[PDB]
Amino acid sequence: KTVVVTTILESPYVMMKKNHEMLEGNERYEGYCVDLAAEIAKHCGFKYKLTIVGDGKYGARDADTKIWNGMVGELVYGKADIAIAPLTITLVREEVIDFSKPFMSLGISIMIKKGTPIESAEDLSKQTEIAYGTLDSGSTKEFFRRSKIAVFDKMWTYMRSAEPSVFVRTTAEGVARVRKSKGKYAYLLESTMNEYIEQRKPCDTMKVGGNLDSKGYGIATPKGSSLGNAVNLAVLKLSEQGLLDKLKNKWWYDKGEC
Amino acid sequence: KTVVVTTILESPYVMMKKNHEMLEGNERYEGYCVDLAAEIAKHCGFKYKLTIVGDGKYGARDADTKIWNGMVGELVYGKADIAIAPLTITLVREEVIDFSKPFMSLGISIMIKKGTPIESAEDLSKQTEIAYGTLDSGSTKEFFRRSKIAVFDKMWTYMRSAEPSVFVRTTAEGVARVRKSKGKYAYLLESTMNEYIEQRKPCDTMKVGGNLDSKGYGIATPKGSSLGNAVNLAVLKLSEQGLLDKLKNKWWYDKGEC
Ligand SMILES: C[C@H]1Nc2ccc(Cl)cc2S(=O)(=O)N1
Ligand SMILES: C[C@H]1Nc2ccc(Cl)cc2S(=O)(=O)N1
Ligand SMILES: N[C@@H](CCC(=O)O)C(=O)O
Ligand SMILES: N[C@@H](CCC(=O)O)C(=O)O
Ligand SMILES: [Zn+2]
Numbered sequence: 245k246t247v248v249v250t251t252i253l254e255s256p257y258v259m260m261k262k263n264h265e266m267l268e269g270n271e272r273y274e275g276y277c278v279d280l281a282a283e284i285a286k287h288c289g290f291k292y293k294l295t296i297v298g299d300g301k302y303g304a305r306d307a308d309t310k311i312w313n314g315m316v317g318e319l320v321y322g323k324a325d326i327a328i329a330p331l332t333i334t335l336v337r338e339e340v341i342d343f344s345k346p347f348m349s350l351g352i353s354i355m356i357k358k359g360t361p362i363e364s365a366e367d368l369s370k371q372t373e374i375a376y377g378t379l380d381s382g383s384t385k386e387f388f389r390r391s392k393i394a395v396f397d398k399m400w401t402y403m404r405s406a407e408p409s410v411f412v413r414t415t416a417e418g419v420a421r422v423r424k425s426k427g428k429y430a431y432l433l434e435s436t437m438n439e440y441i442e443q444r445k446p447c448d449t450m451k452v453g454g455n456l457d458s459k460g461y462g463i464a465t466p467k468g469s470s471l472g473n474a475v476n477l478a479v480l481k482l483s484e485q486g487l488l489d490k491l492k493n494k495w496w497y498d499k500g501e502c
Numbered sequence: 503k504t505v506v507v508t509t510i511l512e513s514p515y516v517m518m519k520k521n522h523e524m525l526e527g528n529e530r531y532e533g534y535c536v537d538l539a540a541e542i543a544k545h546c547g548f549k550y551k552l553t554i555v556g557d558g559k560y561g562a563r564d565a566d567t568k569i570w571n572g573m574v575g576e577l578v579y580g581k582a583d584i585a586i587a588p589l590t591i592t593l594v595r596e597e598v599i600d601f602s603k604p605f606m607s608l609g610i611s612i613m614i615k616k617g618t619p620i621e622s623a624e625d626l627s628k629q630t631e632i633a634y635g636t637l638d639s640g641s642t643k644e645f646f647r648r649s650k651i652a653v654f655d656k657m658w659t660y661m662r663s664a665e666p667s668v669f670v671r672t673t674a675e676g677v678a679r680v681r682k683s684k685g686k687y688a689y690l691l692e693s694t695m696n697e698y699i700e701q702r703k704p705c706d707t708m709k710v711g712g713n714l715d716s717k718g719y720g721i722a723t724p725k726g727s728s729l730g731n732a733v734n735l736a737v738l739k740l741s742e743q744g745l746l747d748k749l750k751n752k753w754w755y756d757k758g759e760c
């Protein structure tokens with residue numbers, strides 16, 4: 245049986261190659277997670293098919309319906325057998341799906357347009373001239389929603405009520421917003437994605453401040469899956485062989501443009 | 503039933519209180535892991551007893567006997583129900599015990615006496631004047647023994663054959679050797695312990711270079727233990743509420759002496 249892998253279009257994790265449409269199936273894609281899926285499949289001994297998540301979201305549970313969307317929903321409702329993506333390990337998710345040990349570390353960070361007079365989250369909260377937001381249906385938004393830290397709850401109170409909306413449907417939308425907004429929009433996103441974008445043309449963005457928290461991405465499977473154990477061990481193996489570090493250098497820093 | 507917790511005397515994770523002789527049970531100890539154990543037990547709803555590991559080791563499997571020693575041993579052989587300690591998540595351990603998601607990140611790092619002419623593992627490997635070693639029966643030694651990376655295998659070949667021995671039985675022994683050796687000994691140990699020592703008088707050592715790897719400590723339980731699930735969720739919860747960061751600050755940097 246071929247394993248259905250859910251993932252998401254997110255640079256440099258999963259990207260359509262420049263040549264694609266002349267290629268077929270898995271070959272259409274490239275990136276850290278595409279390479280990772282390959283090794284994971286190799287060491288676990290399964291064939292697989294990469295599919296881009298239908299609704300284009302990471303995964304959150306609807307307040308009223310209690311229905312999960314995104315890649316999380318795909319696993320929960322049996323539409324996919326495994327997710328291999330920049331998917332954040334969190335408590336509410338670990339309650340409904342299984343995560344491997346983390347394959348990559350990250351924290352919530354701030355992206356600004358170069359020159360923006362912001363140095364920290366504290367800076368954002370103490371002012372109103374520069375607007376800021378996060379991705380919808382992801383862990384960063386939930387982070388601010390649930391934070392008791394004074395600075396972060398202040399930020400959340402502002403964001404949830406802002407007008408026009410400060411939330412974005414995709415990471416690319418957030419980044420495009422920062423770039424087009426003359427320094428009047430800052431974007432809250434994970435450090436991994438922030439650092440990648442910083443080293444890409446037009447080289448007009450910048451990560452400011454330290455990370456707001458510390459967590460990791462994990463490969464996820466439906467609760468009680470038979471793939472769970474093998475995937476976890478494979479991740480540990482790849483980490484100890486240095487393959488994960490290798491992949492990271494290949495996709496972040498070998499690919500620098502600035 | 504009272505949960506038997508195995509841990510290890512290692513600053514600032516677990517230390518004897520100054521007046522420990524006049525105190526009882528769990529009250530004899532203080533430190534990061536003592537604080538963490540209390541929270542874990544509170545959130546999981548069990549009573550517990552802290553016990554220091556008999557042989558003072560973290561855990562390695564004898565090449566010949568195939569017997570596990572240290573904390574891993576206590577778990578494998580049923581002397582303890584859970585280990586809460588700076589116990590590194592590794593593949594060979596994951597095969598015989600279970601680990602929660604990591605509560606703290608670290609990587610192997612280099613400790614030098616200030617002014618030592620070393621900037622990297624590569625630097626260490628290309629020279630002989632400065633000796634270097636690691637702790638016995640731990641993940642750091644196993645990392646070098648197993649590594650295929652040119653630089654790390656080269657270091658291992660030197661270390662395994664060096665005389666007198668470059669290996670030490672305790673972290674404190676390592677640090678003292680760095681301090682006593684006027685620059686001629688470098689010590690390979692986890693970044694967390696390295697960062698801690700850096701902040702203690704006499705302030706004569708420092709961490710140089712980037713980390714050689716990236717991993718974390720996890721709370722360990724015997725394979726198929728009923729505690730596994732609740733402990734994992736507890737770590738994520740405390741992580742997300744910011745407690746882990748607060749504890750690190752308390753024991754590392756708030757008490758800073760340098
Ligand atoms: C408790 C939580 N903490 C951390 C910290 C760092 C990294 Cl890279 C991974 C994790 S996690 O797997 O999400 N577990
Ligand atoms: C695969 C391995 N990678 C990493 C990376 C960072 C941190 Cl803090 C923890 C881990 S781990 O739990 O050992 N899993
Ligand atoms: N990695 C996040 C998506 C990006 C974000 O939330 O900032 C998640 O798994 O939900
Ligand atoms: N944390 C390590 C011990 C310290 C070291 O090996 O440097 C372990 O679990 O084995
Ligand atoms: Zn491989």
Ligand SMILES: [Zn+2]
Pocket residue numbers: 306307308309
């Ligand atoms: Zn709804």
Ligand SMILES: [Zn+2]
Pocket residue numbers: 541544545
């Ligand atoms: Zn608590």
